Amino acid sequence: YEHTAVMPNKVGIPYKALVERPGYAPVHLQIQLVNTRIIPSTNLEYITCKYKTKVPSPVVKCCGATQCTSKPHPDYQCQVFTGVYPFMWGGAYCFCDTENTQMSEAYVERSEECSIDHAKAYKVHTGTVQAMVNITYGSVSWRSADVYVNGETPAKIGDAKLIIGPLSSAWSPFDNKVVVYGHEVYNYDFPEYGTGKAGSFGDLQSRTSTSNDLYANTNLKLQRPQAGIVHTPFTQAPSGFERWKRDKGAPLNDVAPFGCSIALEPLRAENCAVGSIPISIDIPDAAFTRISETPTVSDLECKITECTYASDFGGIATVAYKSSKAGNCPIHSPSGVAVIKENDVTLAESGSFTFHFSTANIHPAFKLQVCTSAVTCKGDC
């Protein structure tokens, strides 16, 4: 028997519902969507990291000159610089402070230290959304079943055939282009692979942590020194990653409008709280209550003794009944402004059984069911 109930996306509140069929006892049914993981397909565009400038050493002729000879490196830049040493500025400097000319060559590579310290440019295409749904059917609360929020793969699992009809527990806070820092993921757009500049993320590229696909556009500008010379000095634009660090977005982990804990190494959105989740549970009939309390239950009143305003499980209420024999008939919340802590209710003739409930409203109105009789409880939270 499949019974479809709707659990508010409140991780930690189990949504009690009854699988009701007249002339059969109601069944304890609690559905908690414990976690939802939006897992998208990630196509790596490039690895990007801090560059390391490589200067082979500039060819300096004291009282001569050298013209640039091109060499194949990702941002190879040379400049021919005359002077080197200003006139009257040295104590064993070159005699020529004019005629002396250095061909200043330098280039960038990836750093050797990009081994694990790198950020990642990701194109993001459409995902699958998993939901870990903990389902109680009868007193068997000991089954929890992954079921896709997406329609891609409904849980054909033996626990209960579960469909989680798509909702806001499924989405993707991951834009077309996503920067991964390595613990905090930021939606940030940048030019597609083979292109990157200062004014966007990436401008040094790789595709593995170190080496592979070395494309640079770090805007290397060779310069001349004011004193001394062992290696030519330079100015540069920062790496596009380094630039991105000076022009950060907002990390998705800490902001995301659906109340999902975006978590990263693969970018994914864990634990949404938005909306309420349809859960279709194919109830396993071996845990189905169906006149399994042979009592007819009669003469009920519900009094709510206390409640605290819209609380975790701050609801305290008492159930009066007469039952033919003592048993357990399951109570529930077909309401969402109150959810019951207990999904079980102690049939007795005492006139008091104290049961606990939960709210998200300042008025607790839930319908409590025993095996044949139904009542409503009300109080003040």
Binding site: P8, N9, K10, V11, G12, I13, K50, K52, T53, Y85, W89, G90, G91, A92, Y93, S111, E112, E113, C114, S115, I116, D117, S168, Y181, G182, H183, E184, P225, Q226, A227, G228, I229, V230, H231, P233, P238, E242, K245, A250, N253, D254, V255, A256, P257, F258, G259, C260, S261, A263, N271, A273, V274, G275, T308, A310, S311, D312, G314, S358, A360
Partner: protein
Amino acid sequence: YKLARPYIADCPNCGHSRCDSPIAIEEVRGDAHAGVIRIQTSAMFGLKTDGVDLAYMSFMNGKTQKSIKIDNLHVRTSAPCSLVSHHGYYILAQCPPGDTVTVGFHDGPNRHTCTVAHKVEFRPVGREKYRHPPEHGVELPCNRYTHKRADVPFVPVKAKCIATLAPEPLVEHKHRTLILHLHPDHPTLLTTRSLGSDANPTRQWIERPTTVNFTVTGEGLEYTWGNHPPKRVWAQES
């Protein structure tokens, strides 16, 4: 390995009338998401006849040369910085920016000090900077370096980072409202959003006791206070 030698390198300003100087730091790596630095210096720090040591260096020039035990030669940003390990050509230290190192010797023919401050920009993968992971507060995965001796370079290590947080995150629950009475001892980044349909994407850095109220869906809210991965409360009196 430990085959490094002392030699000169071009510095922007160093002692004497030429800056083709000793103690000049060729390159610096700030390729961590901690606060630690691997330094490549032309002049060698961290080696006497012992192999890897913690307290001798060597340098040479032509005008202001000699080698010494590290003593007259102080590393600074403007305060001490402590090396941990040497792997020949590479030095490893904990120092706060991890891009700016000023080394100088106040002995010998002149008083030379080279400063390196050329970019290799970094910040932790979180949103708070460290000079090395502290004890205080939450841990965060990050990159750093190897810090144990084993001699080649101290390659990045996926290992813990830690962000300090402030003392009292007094949360106060109400109906659909969470005021966060916060009591900074130090600048904390507070980022929030409510969990649920309602969300409150509000980043702010705070210092000194303040309150900040946010709306709440009734499905919870996240506040990270002092750089954390989500600290979140769910449906209740949130």
